[PDB]
């Protein structure tokens, strides 16, 4: 699937690095890669990067 | 005066107005442990909440 694994942001998150992304509640994260229990990789509003896995809820 | 103090371990960007930002080595003073996960305190003139696990207590 072009969007791959997707999820919806539960809370606000501000990237604290160029390797991270940011989102507002209800934003959609796509092409997720669950690389570890802490940080996942994915896309959000044109930005590619890491984010807290616990800040989103998987939803296809 | 500076109450309970700590040093920032990692970079953190406030997600909201109720939160504060800091870089590694920054000092957080007057810490209030209003929760095991989220503390409150002062950093670089700002007051608010931050991840307790992102700082190391140090007096």
């Amino acid at each position: 699937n072009d969007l791959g694994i997707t999820a919806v942001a539960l809370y606000d998150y501000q990237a604290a690095g160029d390797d991270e992304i940011s989102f507002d509640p209800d934003d959609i994260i796509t092409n997720i890669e669950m690389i570890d229990d802490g940080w996942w990789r994915g896309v959000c509003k044109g930005r590619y990067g890491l984010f807290p896995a616990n800040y989103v809820e998987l939803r296809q | 005066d500076l109450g309970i103090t700590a040093v920032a371990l990692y970079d953190y960007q406030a997600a909201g107005d109720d939160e504060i930002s800091f870089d590694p080595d920054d000092i957080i003073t007057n810490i209030e442990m209003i929760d095991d996960g989220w503390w409150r305190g002062v950093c670089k003139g700002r007051y608010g909440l931050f991840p307790a696990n992102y700082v190391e207590l140090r007096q």
């Binding site: - | 997600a15 929760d35 989220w38 696990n53």
Partner: peptide, 9 residues
């Protein structure tokens, strides 16, 4: 990398 921050209170 650093640990993720806990979900907001």
């Amino acid at each position: 990398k650093r640990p993720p921050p806990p979900p907001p209170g």
